Design a protein around this ligand. Structure first.
Ligand SMILES: [Ca+2]
Length: 288
């Protein structure tokens, strides 16, 4: 391990909390139930998702090549594709709004005709689980467990639907970056952002974490299993020992009811560790 750094991290006391979907709003294969008691020891977690600027420092220091670069392409939402026609490789068979764009990666998130010069304080995207874990190691940190992630995101509140409470738009107003309008064709940007927002935007939750709901998906250390909640230990669960996909949490700027409720604090998903997309980043953590 590199010398530890809790820079840009808040220390949370842990303790017991009720992990899982209280409301039964996820779909069966997500395994958000049963609601089960988890006991966490005190730990540190990034107040924000990792930014473009910090990931640049990592790459400058290490020469890290991301999976998206190695594979040669990454998934870009159809509306923002900024590339020559020859770099469009085809849409995702299952999700036609996801475009496979040659050369799309963290530096050029919409393809070769894009850059991040205006987005240093935006979350880094097109980063795989591998990229995320490599960053954390150089940075003197780790990824949070899924349990740590949910605890931190709940912000000291018990059994709420969202990081801040049960109403999605309290007082009719937005405090997270998701999708409003006719998905996947029209984004009304009611929440003030079409694509990613700065990592500190809106306001923090009760634990001082910003944007755990929406903006970008966030990789956790755990292997995903839809039955793990039923077989989880009480103290510091790390997920199952083997698996195919790693856990991601939070939902993104592309989330809308019609197909997605993933901004709920208890919502969970997963992806193969080497996968990447323009709506998927991460935040780091540490033991106390
Ligand atoms: Ca938005």
């Amino acid at each position: 391990a590199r010398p530890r750094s809790t820079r840009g991290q808040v220390r949370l006391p842990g303790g017991e909390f009720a992990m899982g979907d209280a409301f039964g709003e996820g779909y069966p294969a997500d395994g958000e139930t049963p609601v089960h008691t988890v006991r966490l020891r005190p730990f540190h977690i990034d107040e924000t998702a990792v930014t473009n600027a910090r990931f640049a420092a990592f790459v400058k220091a290490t020469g890290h090549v991301t999976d998206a670069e190695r594979f040669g392409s990454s998934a870009v939402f159809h509306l923002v594709v900024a590339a020559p026609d020859a770099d469009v490789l085809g849409s995702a068979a299952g999700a036609p709004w996801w475009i496979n764009v040659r050369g799309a990666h963290w530096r050029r998130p919409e393809g070769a005709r894009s850059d991040i010069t205006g987005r240093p304080n935006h979350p880094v995207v097109h980063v795989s689980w591998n990229d995320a874990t490599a960053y954390a190691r150089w940075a003197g940190k780790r990824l949070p467990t899924e349990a740590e992630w949910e605890y931190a995101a709940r912000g000291g509140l018990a059994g709420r639907r969202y990081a801040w409470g049960d109403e999605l738009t309290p007082g009719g107003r937005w405090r997270c970056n998701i999708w409003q309008g006719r998905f996947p064709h029209v984004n009304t940007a009611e929440d003030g952002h079409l694509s990613t927002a700065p990592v500190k935007s809106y306001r923090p939750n009760g634990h001082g974490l910003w944007n755990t709901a929406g903006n970008v998906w966030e990789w956790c250390s755990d292997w995903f299993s839809p039955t793990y909640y039923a077989e989880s230990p009480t103290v510091d669960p790390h997920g199952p020992g083997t698996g195919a996909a790693r856990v991601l949490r939070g939902g993104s700027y592309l989330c809308h009811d019609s197909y997605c409720n993933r901004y709920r604090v208890a919502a969970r998903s997963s992806n193969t560790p080497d996968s990447s997309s323009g709506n998927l980043g991460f935040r780091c953590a540490n033991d106390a």
